[PDB]
Symmetry: D2
Subunit: 260 residues, 4 copies
């Protein structure tokens, strides 16, 4: 079948990419980075995120695989020594597929633009103070004033969400988690403080109070959005598909990264 | 149909209970606290928890209702002034049912005992230091040493789970959340720190390291368990059923309790 | 004696400033914003911070006073109705002086520049990831990677330091507190997590690892510093002097702002 | 001079204690556990705490030393291999003294009892809910409701205080820090949340609201106090004296215990 391989760009990843292509050359596998069915990432989770956004238009027909040349990543969970055995099983068919939820971000101005996040999406202020009204299902919830907010996917809870005090959430749960960035709480300003976990079809809407310019990030991508009228968060109907060949539980993957 | 009413025990709740019984006396409704189909709680969330555990053997045929004489509770979300209108709709049939997940706790000795929690279940030490090995799906995760642990239901996240830094989780998500109580983290002792959210069929197992006596709590109930071999946590197959007559969203109920 | 008054710039503060000047016109008081001995701030704590930095060169001969037209500030702790009684006591001499510690920030390039902070000083990254080596008294302590750091004065602990989880510290303690901004902690990156309180003569030094550009803030002021070789933090030998006329304890001032 | 040595009680500590006594036998040193001037602790920080409370009546004439047979302690900061060199310098006189602050706890009933803490003192509830009014310098500050409170010494900030989110505070600062244990914060109950650092002569007073029984701890010691009218916290006028022979900074001691 059709496949493609992306690389971190260093000596270790580039020369491992060529060995897998040569190994695939001994099989009925066609290299194609236009319409691939298998996308292989070699490097780190940052390299994997680039491979995801590079093909975020054909998610429902691509099975992603990650090989970490450095340390164990949550998406790149295949050691380089296991790459030769990876080429064989990936060629003989016969492998399962696992899917993770994604976050959909919509930004309205005064043309509406939408984005797709595998880790999280954050909103910060462009210079001045960050003040937004938080609306959950057309109901005003709180007037947040702090450094920013962060809406995370399940698999993204181990990333930026974790540093903000958020909970680690198993990827089989179709949900999204919102966390606070150094919120202000006194007599006049009051926020919830706690992280919030929203199920599918729950729409969280951020709306400006004074300044209408925001620095919005989607995974590694981050651009200053001007004259923002609304930012909408919701669990996307799209899902990212992984190719599994063995048992590597999520909590087992959490233990190796943070415990030992 | 058959119904029963429990009361906090003060002047305000007892005399409101008699007015509802008299109002039910004008309908085809039979008072019965043996096999009731409608359980009405008047007082606070503490009174509601007693009504839940009083009939936790007939959950699948009881619709719970809560009336708060004090402040707004998350389970007692009906003002006393709305009690007269509550008697009418509850008698003419025609009402929906909403269900919340529950937590199943199993304790093994050396006879196994099981419990059911609507809020959360906590484990603390009987005097000495608290040290337990945490096992997730037969896989060792961490050796916890601190004050204790807390496994919370979705609707219980707004209670003890919130005070421990846990995330607020919508009740439509069939899950359970584990939080830490003043954990120790240095060079030799390392825990995850973050709250963990487990889906259905995930079994979290606590196992003793030295002391085998623990102070285990299930909602308000708490008893010292002796010679404990294992404590097992999992999302229960049972669900608590509420009777709804209007729209009172969970996040709307969170806003009124913590924001204003 | 010589005095000057600064204003927030709105109707309430400007017209209260003129009434105090007219009240001072009935006394042996000379208005002078070149070499004043009494600096009066009318507005909020933000207006007070501007009055402090406007005369941070003559701290040891100025007694600051704050009048809050809005809500109670920690530096502007005089209600506008008490302004007439403030003019009288301020003219008849006979008032005490209280002093608060300050933070000294030094930035080295490759000309060294120094700053003075009444609240706190923060370091963030200019776009890329924030990675700095933390050095305490010429000893390497940790390699921090996160969103940034914040070194706070005692009176500044109730501001940005509080939102980052820092401790509230009484101003009579000559110290400085450092807090973390969404730090990363896994197997390879490890920080202390806890806030650190340093006494006088303790020098905390931040040093770059890769990117040498940082966004450094001192109270409201914040500018991008290019080609930074070192940032040094230490409790300044200078102190800000307040004029007191009554008893308004710090914890009493904390209670009114955050409790009720 | 007069000296005594206490031991953890295992093979490693008991047989190291006898070697130091034999080494002291070659000098003008008299073993005496009645009126010693040098107290040597061999084991861990727990063994050191017992040595402190064993002689807390003669603090101003005792220089404490700690030898850790296990891992590096904050009070036992001498490796067992350095014990032979410790006997020589300790005999030839010529060593400096460093002093750490202590916490004074007073409990009133209806006879007043006082205690001395090197690490911290905690208050918890005897079964029922924990509710106390917090009073700072005869001024009501907050009505706390949670699991308990913890007042820590400077050197105790690295212990229980750290697990509760408290700040790490250098021992040269004569202060005390109060932290919260899973406090409740909603519409009706509001606490400060942040840790509080009090200087000398500041008196923090806890007073019961309903239940007058409390489980009070002082370092390892903890006893149930009945019919409590007041608990008073303040920085003690007494100080614990250490004998130093080299440079081992506090932050350097923090780095080795928590970073590497
Ligand atoms: C760097 N880009 C690729 C990735 C990834 C990733 N994702 C992960 C995941 N899900 N689990 C475990 N490691 C994951 N990595 C590896 C990793 C990256 C940074 C720090 C530590 C690990 C984008 C990621 O920059 C992050 N980030 C920014 N500020 C952060 C902070 N203050 N704290 C944690 N993250 C932070 C957000 O995560 C963003 O998406
Ligand atoms: C008191 N008994 C009935 C109830 C309830 C409830 N449940 C609620 C819920 N889900 N949301 C909102 N209010 C809820 N209340 C009302 C409420 C109770 C205590 C404090 C604040 C509110 C049992 C509850 O004693 C709690 N608890 C103990 N130590 C706590 C702490 N340190 N922090 C928050 N709780 C704590 C656990 O919650 C336990 O179950
Ligand atoms: C706004 N400028 C004047 C001031 C002040 C001040 N100082 C105070 C103090 N010491 N105590 C109590 N209120 C104080 N105010 C009033 C106040 C200001 C902002 C938010 C709440 C209150 C500069 C202040 O912008 C802050 N800031 C930025 N991001 C913050 C956050 N995420 N959280 C709290 N602060 C934050 C830092 O504090 C900076 O110095
Ligand atoms: C065990 N007894 C001797 C000691 C000490 C000490 N003091 C230390 C210090 N200052 N710095 C570094 N290590 C210190 N140890 C070693 C250490 C002890 C326990 C856990 C980790 C280390 C009494 C100590 O039982 C503690 N404790 C209880 N519950 C705790 C928690 N949930 N979290 C941290 N502590 C907790 C309080 O500290 C109490 O005083």
């Amino acid at each position: 079948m059709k496949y493609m391989i992306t690389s971190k760009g260093d000596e270790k990843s580039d020369l491992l990419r060529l060995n897998m292509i040569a190994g695939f050359g001994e099989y009925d596998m066609e290299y194609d980075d236009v319409e691939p069915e298998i996308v292989i990432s070699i490097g780190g989770d940052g390299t994997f995120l680039s491979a995801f956004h590079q093909y975020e238009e054909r998610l429902d027909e691509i099975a992603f695989i990650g090989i970490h040349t450095g340390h164990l990543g949550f998406y790149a969970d295949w050691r380089p020594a296991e790459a030769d055995k990876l080429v064989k099983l990936l060629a003989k068919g016969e492998y399962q597929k696992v899917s993770y939820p994604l976050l959909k971000t919509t930004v309205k101005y005064g043309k509406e633009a939408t984005y797709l996040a595998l880790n999280e999406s954050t909103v910060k202020s462009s210079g001045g103070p960050f003040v937004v009204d938080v609306v959950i299902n057309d109901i005003h919830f709180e007037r947040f004033r702090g450094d920013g907010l962060c809406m995370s996917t399940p698999s993204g809870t181990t990333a930026y969400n974790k540093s903000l005090g958020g909970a680690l959430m198993h990827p089989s749960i179709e949900a999204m988690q919102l966390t606070e960035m150094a919120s202000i709480n006194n007599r006049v300003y009051r926020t919830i403080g706690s992280p919030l976990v929203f199920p599918k079809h729950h729409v969280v809407s951020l709306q400006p109070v004074n300044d209408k310019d925001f620095q919005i990030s989607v995974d590694h991508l981050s651009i200053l959005h001007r004259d923002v009228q609304e930012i909408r968060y919701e669990v996307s109907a799209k899902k990212i598909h992984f190719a599994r060949f063995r048992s590597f539980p999520f909590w087992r993957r959490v233990h190796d990264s943070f415990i030992e």
